[PDB]
Design a protein around this ligand. Structure first.
Ligand SMILES: N[C@@H](CCC(=O)N[C@@H](CS)C(=O)NCC(=O)O)C(=O)O
Ligand SMILES: N[C@@H](CCC(=O)N[C@@H](CS)C(=O)NCC(=O)O)C(=O)O
Ligand SMILES: O=P([O-])([O-])O
Ligand SMILES: O=P([O-])([O-])O
Ligand SMILES: O=P([O-])([O-])O
Ligand code: NA
Lengths: 236, 236
């Protein structure tokens, strides 16, 4: 990622130091009024929200390089209360106060357009996700989430496309899919297993019929093709 | 409003002319190869996706002023294929070819930050919406959609918060909530009318218990209070 590499140097030139975060640590949390611009440079995270009754929702994962905003650039107020939890072992994040972002970007438009590009990908990612997760009930939600996971963390193997995430549980899939009961997730995953769309080996999920997932997640496959052509081409 | 007015003036100074659209017309469509930046100045539109079999997904509405992107600024590639359909009797929009937007924003940081702000509001809207529409099943989806419509198009009256849309139908709510058949939508709407949450009179829906909707759409309620406080204050 060339544009992300130059944006890293620029932040170090301007005195923003890398911060090391560890698995299960929260880079920010929904119970703290802190507005940031997190340039996640390396590692994997998940954006989560917890209800007043304990319902956990995984809004999405982020895999560096990428930008996550918790406050508005103009009003410096909160965009909404979320937690950014690290799920990889180590994560390298450049934490920026929202009150100093406007000046950092105005100075250098190349960097400003990089952050803007990142936000455009975020906008269209969420739209595609909303479409695919809505039109085919919970089957499409699971297939949509599996397709995302296959593209962003998958690697080709003879057993299929291995989703390389440590402890991807039925529970997590449920939190990413709006399914609170792990057993309800299993009922869908089990059906996908009998049709041999996926197999569970080596504590990992192997996707064996990608075309099946595409059929129940068409706008997400379209989005990866248009927005992440290199990610899409690795598995096609 | 103010920032949008200045952006409108700026657009006309650079030769971008306003264009009138009438109900049902598509400002852009999902088979067009050309991509745009649409500055919706006035009117109401919906962003849709039509599947091969003619199934319709309503991704959301847009009420001017706002910015809708169909292509990436940095690559001039499509972000995903959607239709932008006018649902007000008339809409006024400035149609900016995507390959001209980079220069327009480079030349004026005030407007660059305005467009950036609108994309941030899009991001936070979609995340909140995704949280509420996923958690409480179909009821949460309808209540969340109704809450959105209450805040954006609602008018206080002695009979309740009048959703001021011409012909809000049961199918339209289904398209917007991701629900297959009008059957389940009628089943939910019936129960909500029974519980005094809403009523249908004068060919419009009136919300009589806003707190019931807040209960099933807390993240969207949070988002209107944080990102559209004036809009939120209208009803609280
Ligand atoms: N660094 C990669 C990935 C950035 C990223 O995390 N993108 C989000 C979409 S806005 C994503 O792919 N999320 C995958 C998930 O939800 O697991 C890139 O720039 O393409
Ligand atoms: N022009 C108003 C409204 C802009 C707008 O349409 N925002 C979207 C969210 S990105 C919305 O409220 N949609 C309501 C809906 O989906 O009905 C503003 O700038 O606050
Ligand atoms: O729609 P569903 O299949 O019931 O999820
Ligand atoms: O998740 P669960 O409920 O335990 O199944
Ligand atoms: O929607 P429906 O199928 O007619 O019920
Ligand atoms: Na277009």
């Amino acid at each position: 990622n060339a544009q992300a590499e130059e944006f890293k140097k620029y932040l170090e030139t301007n005195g923003i130091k890398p911060k090391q975060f560890h698995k299960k640590e929260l880079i920010f949390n929904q119970w703290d009024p802190q507005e940031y611009c997190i340039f996640l440079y390396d590692g994997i995270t998940k954006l989560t929200s917890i209800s007043e009754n304990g319902t956990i929702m995984n809004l999405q994962y982020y895999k560096g390089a990428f930008v996550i905003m918790s406050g508005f650039i103009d009003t410096e107020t909160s965009v909404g209360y979320y937690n950014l939890e690290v799920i990889s072992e180590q994560a390298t994040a450049y934490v920026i106060k929202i009150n100093e972002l406007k000046e950092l970007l105005s100075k250098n438009l190349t960097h400003f357009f990089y952050v803007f590009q990142t936000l455009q990908k975020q906008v269209s990612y969420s739209l595609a996700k909303f479409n695919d997760f809505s039109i085919n009930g919970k089957l499409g939600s699971i297939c949509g989430q599996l397709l995302i996971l296959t593209y962003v963390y998958g690697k080709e193997t003879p057993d299929g496309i291995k989703i390389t995430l440590d402890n991807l549980t039925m529970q997590e899939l449920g939190y990413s899919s709006g399914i609170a009961h792990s057993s309800a997730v299993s009922r869908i995953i089990s059906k996908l297993k009998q049709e041999k769309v996926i197999v569970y080996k080596n504590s990992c999920f192997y996707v064996q019929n990608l075309d099946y997932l595409k059929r129940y997640a068409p706008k997400l496959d379209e989005w990866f093709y248009l927005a992440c052509p290199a990610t899409w081409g690795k598995l096609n």
